[PDB]
Ligand SMILES: Nc1ncnc2c1ncn2[C@@H]1O[C@H](COP(=O)(O)OP(=O)(O)NP(=O)(O)O)[C@@H](O)[C@H]1O
Ligand SMILES: [Mg+2]
């Protein structure tokens with residue numbers, strides 16, 4: 194029943210798993226390996242990937258989930274399509290992108306998030322909305338055609354009506370501190386409305402769009418890649434230092450006025466600025482962003 198897989202190289206290592214480029218006797222595949230201790234993370238992702246309504250070009254393509262015995266115990270594997278260009282953060286660190294690349298990455302990112310958020314399939318049927326909860330450039334893969342696809346669903350939440358407010362309350366602050374929405378950092382979320390979790394994803398998406406813009410040659414002069422708040426906080430920032438910047442100081446990544454000379458960049462910057470608003474209700478939806486990116490004909 195186990196697939197003929199040979200592990201080749203370690204390509205990624207997060208808080209829950211190790212990812213390997215491997216061969217399936219498509220030949221090249223990615224293998225996300227979790228130890229037994231991280232079973233809950235593997236099962237959360239496997240449940241998200243197993244849903245028939247998740248399938249989308251801007252969502253990582255899932256092949257299968259397996260259980261594999263080892264000498265020191267057992268491992269839990271998720272086998273997906275391999276994207277040679279790797280995660281978006283590593284891609285933006287090496288490359289300066291063109292305006293065409295920014296339009297492609299930006300719209301494919303918005304389309305993937307809008308699909309996760311949607312309470313219905315493209316064919317009109319009801320579907321469970323999913324909030325990623327850990328949107329960041331390292332959880333986005335760059336496809337060969339220079340479009341995006343979302344990966345890493347280990348912290349994701351299926352917006353089930355049976356969810357208890359007390360069961361959501363702790364949990365607690367989930368995600369990566371650097372990309373947490375101000376209301377997440379303030380512990381000020383209304384643990385009732387379904388849109389409130391979708392709004393936190395939109396703020397994180399806005400930081401990602403800023404990262405893409407910061408490396409686009411259409412701005413003119415391009416600086417070395419830096420993650421959001423790179424010059425304000427340490428490498429692995431705590432929630433308190435992030436609250437001090439994003440909330441107390443109302444801080445956001447810098448948009449120099451010279452970027453706004455290009456009409457496309459100006460529209461992108463106006464869009465993401467609305468998406469990172471302090472007030473979650475003032476933010477655009479991922480569907481609005483995808484629509485604004487489709488309007489970028491001229
Ligand atoms: N299909 C894939 N193709 C290529 N690289 C991949 C693939 N899936 C994941 N990676 C890489 O492996 C890294 C870790 O994978 P990920 O699915 O984010 O694991 P994680 O432990 O849950 N990370 P995190 O929760 O963000 O700390 C990613 O950041 C990518 O660099
Ligand atoms: Mg990750």
Ligand SMILES: [Mg+2]
Nearest residue numbers: 207209345347
């Ligand atoms: Mg993860």
